[PDB]
Design a protein around this ligand. Structure first.
Ligand code: NA
Lengths: 157, 79
């Protein structure tokens, strides 16, 4: 799709110019050097001043041919312990839905930043992962403990 | 011619090959090449015999033939 690819080229150019510190977002390069902008390997740094700090969490971002009218799908690889990430790694987030808060004007920067913020402040209106969710609500201590062990597991070493 | 094979070569010696009608505006070829490189349309320039290829140039106009080479460069260079 010319429309999707022309926008993803703009996205990639802007990312290269300037993006938020610690964030990674690299379209997939084919064995032959040519580009697949429909599949991006990303990383989210855990937010500073929070139990997430220090973790660098890989997420894949997949675009469909009706991008930017459609959102990407955003998948943590591996899946993370967090109330709003399904056991699959797929992120439940309203800006990732046409029928909720996705609009064409949302950029990859805002997507990644949106998800970094979600990591830190869960939406209790969406239990995507019932055990992370139940612990978040009923045992914040155990929740914070698991969050710090997970940040530690995914800290660059 | 009816279709001619055009070769697009960059600085790295990589080639991508297009089958195009002589009649068709070379914008489509440019558009595809940029797509394969993952860069905007306005960021690359394409030259044949040292002259810039316009969007509405056709292989017929510029006198192109089977296996002719188009050299591609970064604008500026930038981009
Ligand atoms: Na959707």
């Amino acid at each position: 799709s010319g429309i999707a690819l022309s926008r993803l080229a703009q996205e990639r150019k802007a990312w290269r110019k300037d993006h938020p510190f610690g964030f990674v977002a690299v379209p997939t390069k084919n064995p032959d050097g040519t580009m697949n902008l429909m599949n991006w390997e990303c990383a989210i740094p855990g937010k500073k001043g929070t139990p997430w700090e220090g973790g660098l969490f890989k997420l894949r971002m997949l675009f469909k041919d009706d991008y930017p009218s459609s959102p990407p799908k955003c998948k943590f690889e591996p899946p993370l312990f967090h109330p709003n990430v399904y056991p699959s790694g797929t992120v439940c987030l309203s800006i990732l839905e046409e029928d909720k808060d996705w609009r064409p004007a949302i950029t990859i920067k805002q997507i990644l930043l949106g998800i970094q913020e979600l990591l830190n402040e869960p939406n209790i209106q969406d239990p995507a992962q019932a055990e992370a969710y139940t612990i978040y609500c009923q045992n914040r201590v155990e929740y914070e403990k698991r969050v710090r062990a997970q940040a530690k597991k995914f800290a660059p070493s | 011619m009816e279709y001619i094979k055009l070769k697009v070569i960059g600085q790295d010696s990589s080639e991508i090959h297009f089958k195009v009608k002589m009649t068709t505006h070379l914008k489509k070829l440019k558009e595809s090449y940029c797509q394969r490189q993952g860069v905007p349309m306005n960021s690359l320039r394409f030259l044949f015999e040292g002259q810039r290829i316009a969007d509405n140039h056709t292989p017929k106009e510029l006198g192109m033939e089977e296996e002719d080479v188009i050299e591609v460069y970064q604008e500026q260079t930038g981009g």
